[PDB]
Design a protein around this ligand. Structure first.
Ligand SMILES: [Cu+2]
Ligand SMILES: [Cu+2]
Ligand SMILES: [Cu+2]
Ligand SMILES: [Cu+2]
Ligand SMILES: [Cu+2]
Ligand SMILES: [Cu+2]
Ligand SMILES: [Zn+2]
Ligand SMILES: [Zn+2]
Ligand SMILES: [Zn+2]
Ligand SMILES: [Zn+2]
Lengths: 339, 339, 339
């Protein structure tokens, strides 16, 4: 399309929401291509990632870890206004894996504190894609400090299974998984720092061991458990988007399954079906579709159980509805062996 | 189905066998749905995992690591009687990834020493699935102490390739891969303990490094080599089921291939073909079908060769038959360069 | 085929070239099956892998790491002459994952310094496959010392996508990824050794931590950057073959995509499409096809960004051509917020 043609397309401004929720959108595209505008501010701030008060200097899109999920349709143009407040201390940029050219846009969006930039790119391929900060010479550091998220480019006709059957979800959740590398002092205790830059040297050496100290969903151990559990009802169809910008993960819905799973996260690649545990390589986003059939609590985890239960990669789903004894029943409840 | 309908289905009691062998079963389902009954006892016992006398306090279904493979057909009901002897010391339960609801059955099967329980669930999805113990607050510990196995839910019509062609195996083997985390003393030697509970604190810290000390098949280094090598003959069709309840693995048949591989382990997902090395994420089971064409010894390994040859993840296949020179021949045997 | 029939097939001698380039070949097979002859010499030599002068005693096919890529067509016979000079110190052999029998040929090609051997095998399955040294009792050590490469067995009719559409590449590059495990002294500095054998004991203990000190493409940090960047032009179709003989990797073309990706590396398995980051398990080779649409520099990396930017797994692509503003444009260049 020409500049004039693009300038004549209808525009739509979207207000982003904090994960795990997603901004309002329609699954089937309404009309022709549009220019969808999003705005994000970068915040460098301290966040507490566990119940022991462990602090990390996060670098976060819209102040959250992960950054928010953006949704557009294939062939729409995504126009992002990115702002780096004058009160931040580092240069930042953004690389969209969904985009084509200039290192995903990273080479055209380098902004120092006090600057802003506006990038537009055509969303040519459908699927869920990772986006993350990637400043020359400090790439992994900004990423493992939480500066990453994902976007979803829906086919204009919505989701379909491998044989054209339409798949409409009632709810959608976005789980961003993050590997953190927190330095410890000679006593085995987590160190604290004044400014982000003061934690750099120590962080890099932990990073080089390739072993994270924490692996969490939505920015903190237990961030998605208890009262903050994701919800659904028996019969509801749910789409769970999962991203990991730096490290492999293996999602699994304990008590459930992945009915249709785009493990590679790309919609033109037929989904795998009936999955127990799927795999998402570091630097990618994946999506799983599931229809709940039983009520109760479900654990959604990274299935390397040490990472899930010892490092923090575990979330909950609280589902309401009626129990189906055909699917599963306790014939004899736990009881003493009668001698 | 209603309670009355399920109670009227024919019942079949199965006697489980120790891995790598599998209990007798038919590939094609005989008649209508049945209730298949299995019984497992939990044993907490010390096992020796290498040739240096390294001991670990195992927690094992039917006394083996991995637990035995259970086979049913899609839509059959699996009814398990699980027994925790009064002489054990910990609470245990079971979570079937093949099941739907109550954390895979884990929430309905918590039993203390001296108790038993009976769980029934409908095997609605075909494929190989992991099952493992998962007691609240001690999940990874029971799993990496060997309390896991797999089940296979065969399509009622048996296995088929991606285009409907039937695939009948002559033999089937089950290889359970286990990551162990054994604590070492200030001298670098493996520590020993009196009771399972006494090794907990030390084990957890090794677990947190995410680096296993041993990665073995069938419970011990060399468990499936030498005289205990799995066997086959040229022309025979073999199905190899492989599971890893906690950590990624990458199976490879050295000298052979994976003709048809359900790397995700789910039969409704077409298999990948002609594989050299396939990948099974932690928390999943996979299956590979191969027809031997050459006799001799084959090495079946986790292809991170350090894990295979240094940590223990290597097994053997001894195949009988006639050599095929068309497929491979030594034109000039190793010999001195004639100067 | 019989011995006489094979002896009557036309023969073709190929001169191998150093990676990342590939020897001349035709994508579509010309005529009937042939016997393709290749010759490789093994060199045990010291190579420098980073800019800090870190030395490693490499074991390399034709003196390079990775060894060169060999290309044949399905059903061709590959006949390799392998030479171990009298000046080397260790026994070596070769295992082709593309071959069937005798541990990939490893059991028929064990040669001491001063010996040579000639092996022939039929290339029955199409796809890219790993090949590596694997001497009994020292398998992982020869592999992580760089003694591995890959071969490509093209379908006789050339590459096709999932629905029969032909895929012809203008250029092909071979990126061999290598995990190195270099021992450090009590001061944290990399140790040096006189002979390969003198570094063995120390290397094995680093290997057991399963954590590499370097992860590089084409044998050294920055080997494929700057003036040695791989090249292409907008509109050109490029095939990138990637192998890792021992450890998982997750390739990603920053700024681009994997239009068609055979992540398992086997051509009879339909490719995944529109990939951002793909996964290649250790012990396998994969291939990605991409048509450049934007000029500029692209980074081709292992997307665990710590491994890419801290350990060395990063290469460059320099692409010429005209910028496409429809695909991406800087609407507002980085500029100060006007207060
Ligand atoms: Cu940043
Ligand atoms: Cu990226
Ligand atoms: Cu248990
Ligand atoms: Cu599980
Ligand atoms: Cu060698
Ligand atoms: Cu191999
Ligand atoms: Zn696949
Ligand atoms: Zn008693
Ligand atoms: Zn001589
Ligand atoms: Zn101001």
């Amino acid at each position: 399309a020409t500049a004039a043609e693009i300038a004549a397309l209808p525009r739509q401004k979207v207000e982003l929401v904090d994960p795990p929720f997603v901004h309002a959108h329609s699954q089937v595209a309404e009309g022709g291509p549009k220019v969808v505008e999003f705005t994000m501010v970068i915040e460098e701030k301290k966040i507490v990632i566990d119940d022991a008060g462990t602090e990390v200097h996060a670098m976060a899109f819209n102040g959250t870890v992960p950054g928010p999920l953006m949704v557009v349709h294939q062939d729409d143009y995504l126009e992002l206004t990115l702002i780096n407040p004058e009160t931040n201390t580092l240069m930042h940029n953004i690389d969209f894996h969904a985009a084509t050219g200039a290192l995903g846009g990273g080479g055209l969006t380098e902004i120092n504190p006090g600057e802003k930039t506006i990038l537009r790119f055509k969303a040519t391929k459908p699927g869920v894609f990772v986006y993350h900060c990637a400043p020359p010479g400090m790439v992994p550091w900004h990423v493992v400090s939480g500066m990453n998220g994902a976007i979803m480019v829906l086919p204009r006709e919505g989701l379909h299974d491998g044989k054209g059957k339409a798949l409409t979800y009632d709810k959608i959740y976005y789980v961003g998984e993050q590997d953190f590398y927190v330095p410890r002092d000679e006593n085995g205790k987590y160190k604290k720092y004044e400014a982000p830059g003061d934690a750099y040297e120590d962080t890099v050496k932990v990073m080089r061991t390739l072993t994270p100290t924490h692996v969490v969903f939505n920015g903190a151990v237990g961030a998605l458990t208890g009262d903050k559990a994701m919800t659904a009802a028996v019969g509801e169809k749910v789409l769970i988007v999962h991203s990991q910008a730096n490290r492999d993960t293996r999602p699994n819905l304990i008590g459930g399954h992945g009915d249709y799973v785009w493990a590679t996260g790309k919609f033109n690649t037929p989904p795998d079906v009936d999955q127990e545990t799927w795999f998402i390589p570091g630097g990618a986003a994946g999506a799983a579709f599931y229809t709940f059939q039983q009520p109760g609590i479900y654990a959604y985890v990274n299935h390397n159980l040490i990472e899930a239960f010892e490092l923090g990669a575990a979330a909950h789903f609280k589902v309401t509805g009626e129990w189906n004894d055909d699917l599963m029943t306790s014939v004899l409840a736990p009881s003493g062996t009668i001698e």
